[PDB]
Amino acid sequence: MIGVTLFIALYDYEARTEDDLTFTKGEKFHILNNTEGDWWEARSLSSGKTGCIPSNYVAPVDSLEHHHHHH
């Protein structure tokens, strides 16, 4: 969806609190709230669950894709 940034997990993460998400590397996310800074609220596109993730464990998918001019 245009205007919505897709994120991908670069590492596995086991939930450390009741509000954390557990996820595996490659998992896709939408970010819902980034105000905590080091922790972001996200919704997992794999499980449909919502919770906190470490902000440094994910990256925008568009940052990691190969781009070519002609489309």
Curated annotation (Swiss-Prot):
Detected in neutrophils, monocytes and natural killer cells (at protein level). Detected in monocytes and large lymphocytes. Ubiquitinated. Becomes ubiquitinated in response to ITGB2 signaling; this does not lead to degradation. Phosphorylated. Autophosphorylated on tyrosine residues. Becomes phosphorylated in response to FCGR2A and/or FCGR2B engagement, cell adhesion and signaling by ITGB2. It is found in: Cell membrane; Cell projection, Ruffle membrane; Cytoplasm, Cytosol; Cytoplasm, Cytoskeleton. It comes from the Eukaryota. Interacts with ITGB1, ITGB2, MS4A2/FCER1B, FCER1G, FCGR2A and/or FCGR2B. Interacts (via SH2 domain) with SYK (tyrosine phosphorylated). Interacts (via SH2 domain) with FLT3 (tyrosine phosphorylated). Interacts with PTK2/FAK1. Interacts (via SH2 domain) with HCLS1 (tyrosine phosphorylated by SYK). Interacts with SIRPA and PTPNS1. Interacts (not phosphorylated on tyrosine residues) with CBL; FGR tyrosine phosphorylation promotes dissociation. Interacts with PIK3R1 and FASLG. Interacts with CLNK. It is linked to Mutations that cause aberrant kinase activation can confer oncogene activity and promote aberrant cell proliferation. Belongs to the protein kinase superfamily. Tyr protein kinase family. SRC subfamily. Non-receptor tyrosine-protein kinase that transmits signals from cell surface receptors devoid of kinase activity and contributes to the regulation of immune responses, including neutrophil, monocyte, macrophage and mast cell functions, cytoskeleton remodeling in response to extracellular stimuli, phagocytosis, cell adhesion and migration. Promotes mast cell degranulation, release of inflammatory cytokines and IgE-mediated anaphylaxis. Acts downstream of receptors that bind the Fc region of immunoglobulins, such as MS4A2/FCER1B, FCGR2A and/or FCGR2B. This is Tyrosine-protein kinase Fgr. It comes from Homo sapiens. The chain holds residues 77 to 138 of 529 of the full protein.
